[PDB]
Amino acid sequence: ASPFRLASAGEISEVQGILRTAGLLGPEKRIAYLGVLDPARGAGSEAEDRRFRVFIHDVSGARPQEVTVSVTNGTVISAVELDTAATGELPVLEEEFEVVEQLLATDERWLKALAARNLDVSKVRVAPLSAGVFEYAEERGRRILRGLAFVQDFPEDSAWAHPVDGLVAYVDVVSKEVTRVIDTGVFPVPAEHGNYTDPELTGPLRTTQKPISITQPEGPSFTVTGGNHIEWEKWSLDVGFDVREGVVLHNIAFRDGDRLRPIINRASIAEMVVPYGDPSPIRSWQNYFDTGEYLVGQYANSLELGCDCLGDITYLSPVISDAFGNPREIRNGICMHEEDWGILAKHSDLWSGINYTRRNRRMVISFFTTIGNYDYGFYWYLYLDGTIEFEAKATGVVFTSAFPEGGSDNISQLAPGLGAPFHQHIFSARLDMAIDGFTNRVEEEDVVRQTMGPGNERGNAFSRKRTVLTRESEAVREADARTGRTWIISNPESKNRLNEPVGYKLHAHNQPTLLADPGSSIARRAAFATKDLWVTRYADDERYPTGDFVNQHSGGAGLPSYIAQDRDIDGQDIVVWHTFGLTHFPRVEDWPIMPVDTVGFKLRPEGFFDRSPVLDVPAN
Amino acid sequence: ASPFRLASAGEISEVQGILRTAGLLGPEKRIAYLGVLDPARGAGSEAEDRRFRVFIHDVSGARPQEVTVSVTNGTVISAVELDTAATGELPVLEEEFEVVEQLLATDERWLKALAARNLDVSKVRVAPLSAGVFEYAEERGRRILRGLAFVQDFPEDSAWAHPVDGLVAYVDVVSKEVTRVIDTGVFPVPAEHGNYTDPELTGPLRTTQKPISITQPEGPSFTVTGGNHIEWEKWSLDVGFDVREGVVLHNIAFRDGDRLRPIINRASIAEMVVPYGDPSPIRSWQNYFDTGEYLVGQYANSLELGCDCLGDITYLSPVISDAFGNPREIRNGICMHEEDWGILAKHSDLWSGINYTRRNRRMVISFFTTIGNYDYGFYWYLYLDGTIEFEAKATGVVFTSAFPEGGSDNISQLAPGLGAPFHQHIFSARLDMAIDGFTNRVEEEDVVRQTMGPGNERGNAFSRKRTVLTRESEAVREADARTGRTWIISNPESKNRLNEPVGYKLHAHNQPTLLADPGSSIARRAAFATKDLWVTRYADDERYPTGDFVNQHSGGAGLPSYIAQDRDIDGQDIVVWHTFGLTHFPRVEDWPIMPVDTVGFKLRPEGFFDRSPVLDVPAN
Ligand SMILES: [Cu+2]
Ligand SMILES: [Cu+2]
Ligand code: NA
Ligand code: NA
Ligand SMILES: [Xe]
Ligand SMILES: [Xe]
Ligand SMILES: [Xe]
Ligand SMILES: [Xe]
Ligand SMILES: [Xe]
Ligand SMILES: [Xe]
Ligand SMILES: [Xe]
Ligand SMILES: [Xe]
Ligand SMILES: [Xe]
Ligand SMILES: [Xe]
Ligand SMILES: [Xe]
Ligand SMILES: [Xe]
Ligand SMILES: [Xe]
Ligand SMILES: [Xe]
């Protein structure tokens, strides 16, 4: 009954049937994206209309379509032909991944390059990589992937150990033609294997780890109703899943006494980009928008119990469309569990004689995805004390190259002859705020140092200042760790018992933002990544910081275009877009498989409550 | 047999006996500090000499002494009379805490102040607070505490809810005289109670939290031998305890194949300061050096199982001296346990067909202390992957004041009429480094942006730079979060298999440092707190960033004096001192008892190992 419920297999089959009936899904058509649309603002009192958005590709070369379907009513709402040279190519199809290697295997230029390096074509894997937009005019309006080669010595070998540097190829995956093969010269293909399950490399496995058993004999403290509505320790929300964004949180609210108080209307990772910092022409075009180009949700892992998620786990198994419109379940794709989180509050008071200790917990909602060599975990946390946090966990196998004789300013050495190009992993969290409702504003808060003098004779005073961001033109902000800069989202019409507007404070990690030159292609396509915080006025069609079609799409869409409207954001329905990322100079310890590294952000209540919200937590 | 073993009750009793026999511990003498000294550099092949350092106070007004005793040989090594006006007062004695209230209760000025506010003297608690060094010339050479008043309505009432603003008193705790009583005017004493165990305030306790059971059916994976030597998942160290610093880690090393490789020789929190930012004369002198003035180890809590430390816990019960030299055990004062830490490494490879997941764990060594209203947890973590981390957890009850009519730039409102002055909690971690041995150096590493142009035509390149800190004069460094600044400690004579010096990288949180005006008393006494990183050449007498005697001691000692020596630190025995802290603008959610907030730092291996050190971790 909830309009925020997960898409069911039946709904996807029905979208398929509606499209077929309407003449929009014949044998040459493929679904490159399909997702449920969120309900419009208002229309809660109105009857429900489940609508799905679909991007339809055509393998015969005809123009793709953007389509909206009402599965409730069995109708096509809208259908429009896309001009991809203008608005962008559709996301990469899973079926196109294999096409790069297959086509290159019978290309005379590719074969000549491999023969020069004494490499057997049957052993050469080709990573199918997004192309971006550079100086190649013939690529405009065409679906291109670029291929980098890695040798696989045998079926179970890790090809990443054996990059073939000095070689790159470009392929049109629709017309099935190799457009270009660039060979800048032979590099030695690194010879050491990177097989992290081979006993020769691991040595004898440790026998020293005794078991840790985490159980809940009475079950978990959270409830799941309507498939995806969670209630836990005063929190409530709906766990959505989208093939592009992955896990999406809807209607995050907190029950304070009798009142259900909204905090965040929608929380998602709306984009992530991995720009590479190696100026070699073999990789200088390399920027993976895993969300926008590849769709991270579609590659979500099935998570095994006791391995990926430990404890008393409740799973969701979201359904997505395959390329033909048939439903496909991602079995155990979302993990949900609560875990202990150390001490919540503690005081031993001399005067009263009262000793007091309470323990903390957090609700965890997560998924893990695999994009080629990369594996990312996306974790949302809700804490007893009102804190909301996101954490990304990056692991997998690092993307490799040759390590140049005489070293490199842009590549790390991992093993003899084996390099790892420098890169970043940068995320954009889109937080459609609803602090006590939709009438919100954002202030930038800095610490203020004070000069010793009149009114401050001992030179000890310090303070802070808040600046309201009143319009979108002044709401593109950078970090300032030195001055403890944070951003507070408040509701100017909702006051706490001390007559102060209720609010939440966003605490960033203040990691470096996009490092590329501001005149680069990537600085334009990932403009969002150049600044730490953006605030926009809510609009239903402003979904991603990079726009709807990122693949082979220049600047022109996304956040810079949204804020040009210069809309009022002082006590309005607003959206915060926070950029945060890891800058990775790979270390030898990252090879042959990388230990997890993390980045994230959190929001803490700031006069939202009238006192601590965890006074009613019981002892022990 | 280990020279790093915890002090035993017998050793402390023996120090007492040696001092007594030597004529240094008569009836008027009190021990203000006692701790074991670490073994000297070298002397490992030599027979052991357990030496203790003692600060002896005299209640009759005679000059205190600094004494070194050999408990092994039953001798006094050295004994010197201290001139406290020059070198500093001894740490506050626990017995002096109560003296402030007791003396004030019969003082006519104090009684007049309380009568003006209609407060019953029997209900007025006085916080005994360190005095610092300000403009009062008669305090020089005298042991002074300052008192701030809080009303306790009944025995179990939280006095912190009822601050008596506009009033402060100064007391000589040796001569037992009230030197000054300052009354700047009456403020309303806030009336609401802050009793967080009163059902009227908590409401009905939650019944929604189902149990979480964490057990280890085969016991823990770590071993404890010789009382305090820990071995866990290739790590080894000795867990010390000092009454000043609290838990100290010695000989942190990692067993890589057959070789035990040192990483850190000694790790401690060598100081912590809590400066207040309220310019009111009632509190503008307020700066608590909890480590240096109060001795945090001495107030370590006894930690209850299932409440303070959850899981399979192994406790240490460190012994300290009381004021007369008798041993006193802090029962269950140190917690040791291992815990699961999510995914360690994960990759699902298309080409090889191999799916791989490993789980992480960390060893946790912790204690919790209480200083008046404040409670701090100190946590050290060792991870499977070689990462070392420290985390401080701050909780307790916030220090309160009146909230001024018409607001304040330096105080937050918590409840009607109730204020919380702005302040910081700033820590100094002293890391006596031993990366593969004692020959170490530090480099500052910054990200380097590159300009689009020749050699970087697409404007994607980025790099980094390292600057060796060669001498102490150039080793006082600040954070730069924007450029991803870190510091690498390496051994220039120990190379990994890729011919690069082995190293560890320190990752700071880049929180603001000391905010006080540089000309203030606190900026001089806590000079260490004004900069993020210091590197010194190791010396046995350079123990604390504030020197040996912090109480009522001006600038002149500590880190600024150490680095003036301008010693070679490029491939030498060096010590890193990292400043890190929380800047606290109290929120309503902090009242009436504050949810934990955290700050810390970590160090990660940086080409220390020849490949990932966790390839031998078993599945599941
Ligand atoms: Cu990376
Ligand atoms: Cu604080
Ligand atoms: Na909003
Ligand atoms: Na050292
Ligand atoms: Xe079109
Ligand atoms: Xe929840
Ligand atoms: Xe879907
Ligand atoms: Xe579909
Ligand atoms: Xe791949
Ligand atoms: Xe969550
Ligand atoms: Xe990450
Ligand atoms: Xe003296
Ligand atoms: Xe350990
Ligand atoms: Xe001790
Ligand atoms: Xe003693
Ligand atoms: Xe106290
Ligand atoms: Xe530890
Ligand atoms: Xe803290």
UniProtKB/Swiss-Prot annotation, chains A, B:
Keyword annotations of the record: Copper, Disulfide bond, Metal-binding, Oxidoreductase, TPQ
One GO process term, biological-process aspect: amine metabolic process
EC number, UniProt record: 1.4.3.21
Transmembrane segments: none
PTM (free text): Topaquinone (TPQ) is generated by copper-dependent autoxidation of a specific tyrosyl residue.
UniProt catalytic activity: a primary methyl amine + O2 + H2O = an aldehyde + H2O2 + NH4(+); 2-phenylethylamine + O2 + H2O = 2-phenylacetaldehyde + H2O2 + NH4(+)
Task performed by this protein: Catalyzes the oxidative deamination of phenylethylamine to phenylacetaldehyde with the concomitant production of hydrogen peroxide and ammonia.
Subunit: Homodimer.
Name of protein: Phenylethylamine oxidase
